[PDB]
Amino acid sequence: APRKSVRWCTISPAEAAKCAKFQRNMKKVRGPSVSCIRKTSSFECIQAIAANKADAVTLDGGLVYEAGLHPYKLRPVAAEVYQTRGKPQTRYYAVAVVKKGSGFQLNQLQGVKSCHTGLGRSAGWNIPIGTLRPYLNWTGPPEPLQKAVANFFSASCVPCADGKQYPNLCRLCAGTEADKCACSSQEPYFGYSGAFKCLENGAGDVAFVKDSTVFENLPDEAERDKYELLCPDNTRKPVDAFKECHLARVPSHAVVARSVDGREDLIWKLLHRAQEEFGRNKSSAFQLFGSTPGEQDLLFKDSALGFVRIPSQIDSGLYLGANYLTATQNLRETAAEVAARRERVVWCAVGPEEERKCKQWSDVSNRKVACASASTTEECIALVLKGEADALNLDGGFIYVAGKCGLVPVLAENQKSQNSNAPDCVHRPPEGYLAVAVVRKSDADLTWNSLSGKKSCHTGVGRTAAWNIPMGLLFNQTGSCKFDKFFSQSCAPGADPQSSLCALCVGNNENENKCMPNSEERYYGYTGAFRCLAEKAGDVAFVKDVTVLQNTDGKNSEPWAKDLKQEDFELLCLDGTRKPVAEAESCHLARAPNHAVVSQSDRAQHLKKVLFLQQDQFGGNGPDCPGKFCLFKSETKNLLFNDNTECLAELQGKTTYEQYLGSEYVTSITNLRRCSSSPLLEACAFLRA
């Protein structure tokens, strides 16, 4: 029954004392217990926990990142919350404080003495040095960045700096013999405050800090008018306009632990009660977010409202978020590397057959596109979220989540629709596709009204054509959320494998991977679903009219198909009517949005431009399609895009997810969520807040 005490990793004599007072205040409270291990730095604290020598340490963004790097695998368990001047947050602005009349503009920093909180943290280093990178003249990765900055500022006070090799980086540090440049509250200038003083005492001319710092020691407006903000555009404004003025915005500091056996469950209890037993003015016997006049920021960041518990799928990268990981990694990749990465495009494949495919496209384009894959649509969405990946094709069903995660649909898949297949596609308004209800005419007693407890084949859950529309419908008639209970059994990969919904699925040829949601599941997607009913594994196939068409009457030359015939298939129609496969126009459940590639709005454009190129060299009329590669072709296997894709088009202004899918569906979908919820939709829920 008992569960251990949280080992908290301190960093200087200061921290312990504080940690101390906490542990005891804690027990005096009859709350989960604590303890303090003792090392010398945040970087150290990391390793310690790594080797289960301890369990937690509140970390800076910059440090979180390192903490997540391979060997250690640390996770932002909890997040602090601060000022904002109004509505509380987990994001903070990174600035530059200089004394009125110092003159120099941010682009002029060469020659100035500068202050820094410590090595590698956001506000003081990560953000700043990257900004000024364009004036460093530093070979890149091969040549130590320390020497750069070293030689960029006349001298300075860099905590954790390797002042032996680059003494200039700790010159300014006012610290005793070895306390000098120490990487803890033993160095007076270490930390936000730290830096501010380093500027206040005239040591430096520019401090890189937290947006609240200044107000965090200048209680009197007057004093506050003595200083300013170096805005990235080259002007200077007042300390309280960080809002416009700032080098960057960066995510909150966080309580980190182990990828595995972190004891998350003990940590969060500790902090939760802590907010509650000694946070914002609750008692007077102790104060979490209160530190000595000697040193600030002990254990947590001073005057932090409190914490928020991060959801678990969140692993650092993500926590950070794109914008930050790129630049952070940017300070350790060559310019070349850099510009390289900016000009290309990494596509995110789901499943092997696809990666293969992405591999082709790669070699065919001469690397203008490269590849990033994984086992689940979710998965490739995250990757874009993290920045290992730029983009991929989504179906409206994933559009919705992607959109929830802040991504935007760039180009649309436009079928060789029918009117006039001239370069109309490009401008042609995406006209949609019909999700139909399919079964064996053979089996006619059957209707839409009959599907209670029968066999169903779904292309994928969380997808439109199949899942979304029908279940949504069924949701409208059953008044109940037990999706697995409706059809006797089912085939719908990405469902819980030990459920009926993944009952009728066949895993790859060697029957492995039952229910995964990708092409190995021979019953996955459009085709796979049509066959699941074809091989009669089930009775009702939720798919697109077109679907049937593509594999019957000798279309797909695959055995299971081969002798399939249009006439053999009937459409269930919303009024109990059944029709042949052609009357779809009047025999469908509804109209689905065409699929849509997507990425971070950021690259929105460049994404568009090279794909447009790629599509002029390899899609519908690809001068080289039947020749050395066809982007839009994949052996009735739908690799990357639908096999009938004429091309990809302009969204006719639909630029926000809602716009593209439209209110209704969107609403249709948000209704279902009342039934269920996914991991990533949740994740984002907290990140985008």
Among 122, 500, 600, 634, binds Sm ion (CB under 5 A): 122
* 588 annotated as a binding-site residue: no
CB of 463 to Sm ion, least distance (A): 5
> Among 5, 21, 35, 73, which one carries the catalytic annotation?
73
Tokens of 422: 């001239």
Find the shortest distance in angstroms from Cβ 205 to Sm ion. Answer: 21
Annotated binding residue 433? yes
Residue 135 marked ligand-binding: no
Total number of residues shown for the chain: 689
Residue number, 23 or 518, with CB nearest to Sm ion: 518
- Which residue is it, tokens 């509804």? 590
Q: Does 436 bind Sm ion (CB under 5 A)?
A: no
The answer to whether 234 is annotated as binding is: no
Size of the site for Sm ion (CB under 5 A): 5
Q: Report the nearest approach of Sm ion to the CB of residue 124 (Å).
A: 7
What distance lies between CA 111 and its chain's CA centroid?
A: 39
Residue 465 touches Sm ion, criterion: CB under 5 A: yes
Rounded to a whole number of angstroms, the minimum distance from the CB of residue 606 to Sm ion is 27
The sign one gets for the Cα dihedral 318, 322, 323, 327 is: positive
* Residue 667 three-state SS: helix
| CA-wise closest residue to 22 among 3, 12, 7 | 7
Strands 392-394 and 227-231: unpaired
Q: Which is nearer to Sm ion, 60 or 545 (CB)?
A: 60
Q: What share of the chain is helix, strand, coil (3-state, %, to 5)?
A: 35, 20, 45
Is 124 annotated in some ligand binding site?
A: yes
- 63/74 Cα distance (integer angstroms): 10
169 vs 592 by CB, closer to Sm ion: 592
Judged by CB under 5 A, the residue of 57, 123, 304, 348 near Sm ion is 123
Query: 643: annotated binding-site residue?
Result: no
Q: Report the helix count and the strand count for the chain, using DSSP H and E.
A: 26, 26
- Counting contacts by CB under 5 A, is residue 216 touching Sm ion? no
* 463 annotated as belonging to a binding site for a ligand: yes
Is 121 marked as a binding-site residue?
yes
Q: DSSP labels for 484-517?
A: HHHSSEEE-TTS-TTSTTBSS---STTS-STT-S
Least separation in angstroms between CB 60 and Sm ion = 5
DSSP 255-302: EEEETTT--HHHHHHHHHHHHHHHSTTS-SS--TT---SSS---SS-T
Give the shortest CB-590-to-Sm ion separation in angstroms: 13
- Closest CB to Sm ion among 122 and 600? 122
Catalytic-role residue among 259, 312, 557, 677 = 259
**CB closer to Sm ion out of 395 and 650:** 395
In whole angstroms, what is the distance from residue 190 CA to residue 237 CA? 25
Report the C-alpha gap between 501 and 491 in whole angstroms: 5
Q: Indicate the residue among 45 and 465 with the shorter CB distance to Sm ion.
A: 465
- Determine whether the annotation assigns residue 272 to a binding site: no
Backbone angles phi, psi at 156, to 5 degrees: -170, -170
Q: Is 73 a catalytic residue?
A: yes
Least distance to Sm ion, CB of residue 342, Å: 26
Question: By beta-carbon distance, which residue lies closest to Sm ion?
Answer: 395
Spatial separation of the C-alpha atoms in residues 173 and 221, rounded to whole Å: 28
Find the binding residues for Sm ion in span 394-413 (CB under 5 A). 395
Residues 40-79 that bind Sm ion (CB under 5 A): 60
CA distance 632 to 624: 12
Nearer to Sm ion, 62 or 622 (CB): 62
Task: Locate the DSSP E strands across 416-512.
Answer: 433-440, 455-458, 489-491
Q: Which stretch binds Sm ion (CB under 5 A): 159-167, 331-339, 459-467, 598-606?
A: 459-467
259 labelled catalytic: yes
User: In angstroms, what CA-CA distances link 387 with 28, 128, 250, 254, 374?
Assistant: 47, 21, 16, 21, 14
* Burial of 40 per CB tally in 10 Å (0-12, 13-18, 19+): middle
Where does this chain bind Sm ion (CB under 5 A)? 60, 122-123, 395, 465
Annotated binding-site positions for D-glucose: 430, 594, 660
Catalytically annotated residues: 73, 259
Annotated binding-site positions: 60, 92, 117, 121, 123-124, 192, 253, 395, 430, 433, 459, 463, 465-466, 526, 594-595, 660
Annotated binding-site positions for Fe(3+): 60, 92, 192, 253, 395, 433, 526, 595
